[PDB]
């Protein structure tokens, strides 16, 4: 989307592989805050949003 109206999607009821994302070398930017990207495949949350 045009960023003033940024896309939102609820992520829930599913396992989220972050390893494919931190492995995705085509990302010109890939950054994490409050937590390490390597830790994410151990973590759990009620929801996530894209």
């Amino acid at each position: 989307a045009s960023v003033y109206a940024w896309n939102r999607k609820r992520i829930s009821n599913c396992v989220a592989d972050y390893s494919v994302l931190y492995n995705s070398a085509s990302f010109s930017t890939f950054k994490c805050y409050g937590v390490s990207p390597t830790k994410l495949n151990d973590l759990c949350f009620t929801n996530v949003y894209a």
Partner: protein, 50 residues
């Protein structure tokens, strides 16, 4: 910022009681033997509070 004060972000093992390690070698986050690679799979370990 006063940049003179910095902390190690990550290490392959966490400290034992008063363990000391001043090595600034590029941190390895994945399968890449770093050899000077920074920003993807490998990183500079010290971060300034600035």
């Amino acid at each position: 910022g006063n940049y003179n004060y910095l902390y190690r972000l990550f290490r392959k093992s966490n400290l034992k009681p008063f363990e000391r390690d001043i090595s600034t070698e590029i941190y390895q986050a994945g399968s890449t033997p770093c050899n000077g690679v920074k920003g993807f799979n490998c990183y500079f370990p010290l971060q300034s509070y600035g």
